[PDB]
């Protein structure tokens, strides 16, 4: 297991995308761990469609929130998930209109992260790939993210609101981190990625409600 990866640099990560007034980061978050397994196990990676998880995975509330959990289950019982090109994002709930012709990956359940273990976290992007995680994103520091090894005391290491995706880990001047990727545009962080503290106390709780899909 490698002291740092990055799974842009592997081809595993579309584009950052921007949610909008939208509370569907759950979507983009599974939306991008499927990403990053169908790059795995097929060797191409093809934009899948988070606005098919909004209006479908009706376990979920669509712009309401939701699990990420509750959307691979989905995508499971429904055999399949389709692209951004058949499927695309418009930031507001509709009824299903999955085409199963435009079906361009699968699902065959998922597994969670033990909490806390962020050992076990680390050992999961390196061997799997990316990984779905949700943090405490309420701060105004998170918000206001640019650069740096991000770590903000009053981040709630215990109730977490907001889904992002483990696209890699590392080090830099000294601080091990995790390399997300969020849904707020390119305008945020840096350049719509942030990178997170690691080993210091599941900070800002992110081996909470961690898991990927099977393929």
Known sequence: VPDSIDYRKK???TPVKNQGQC???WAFSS???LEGQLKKKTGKLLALSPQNLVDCVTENYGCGGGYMTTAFQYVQQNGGIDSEDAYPY???DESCMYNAAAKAAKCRGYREIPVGNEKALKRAVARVGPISVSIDASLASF?????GVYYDENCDRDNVNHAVLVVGYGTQKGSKHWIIKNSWGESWGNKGYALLARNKNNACGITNMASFPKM
């Open 11 to 13: 081809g595993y990560v």
């Open 23 to 25: 509370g569907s980061c």
């Open 31 to 33: 939306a991008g761990a």
């Open 90 to 92: 418009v930031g507001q």
């Open 143 to 147: 918000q206001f993210y640019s650069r």
